[PDB]
């Protein structure tokens, strides 16, 4: 907070993801410009579906 805000608590369910494969993406994305600027809560169905992830049950 003395010059820039501190890094918030990383969600524990995402800490489990091994990030070594992701190192190829480290300078290859625009987090803020990819999105269709609609709504965040709309992510429940706009993102992907059960057939897309091979839902087991």
């Amino acid at each position: 907070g003395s010059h820039m805000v501190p890094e918030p608590d990383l969600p524990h369910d995402l800490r489990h993801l091994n990030t070594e494969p992701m190192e190829i993406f480290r300078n290859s994305v625009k987090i803020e410009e990819i999105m269709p600027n609609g709504d965040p809560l709309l992510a429940g169905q706009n993102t992907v579906d059960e057939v897309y992830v091979s839902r087991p049950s």
Binding site: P6, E7, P8, D9, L10, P11, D13, L14, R15, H16, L17, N18, T19, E20, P21, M22, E23, I24, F25, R26, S28, V29, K30, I31, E32, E33, I34, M35, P36, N37, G38, D39, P40, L41, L42, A43, G44, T47, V48, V51, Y52, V53, S54, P56
Partner: protein, 100 residues
């Protein structure tokens, strides 16, 4: 603010893969609607499209040989449910989808 509980470097890596999949999910639909058109430009659009098409049929899940498959399956499920306005990972996406 720098330990494994927050890790600025890692925090950006899960965000970047998450958003790349979100782009590629609809971009795969856009591309198939015109067969295989080269109209895109995302550095890993092809990388994600290969992982996504695989994920749509993969049944090995937690034991799969594709490093991005099981990771992507878990990464999508976070953004699908999170609503916290100060989540370190979702904040740039929650901003990318804001009315401002």
């Amino acid at each position: 603010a720098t330990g494994p509980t927050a890790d600025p470097e890692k925090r950006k890596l899960i965000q970047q893969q998450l958003v790349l999949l979100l782009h590629a999910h609809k971009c795969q639909r856009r591309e198939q609607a015109n067969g295989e058109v080269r109209a895109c430009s995302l550095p890993h659009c092809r990388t994600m499209k290969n992982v996504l098409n695989h994920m749509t049929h993969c049944q090995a899940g937690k034991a799969c040989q594709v490093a991005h498959c099981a990771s992507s399956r878990q990464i999508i499920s976070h953004w699908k449910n999170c609503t916290r306005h100060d989540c370190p990972v979702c904040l740039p996406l929650k901003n990318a989808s804001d009315k401002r």
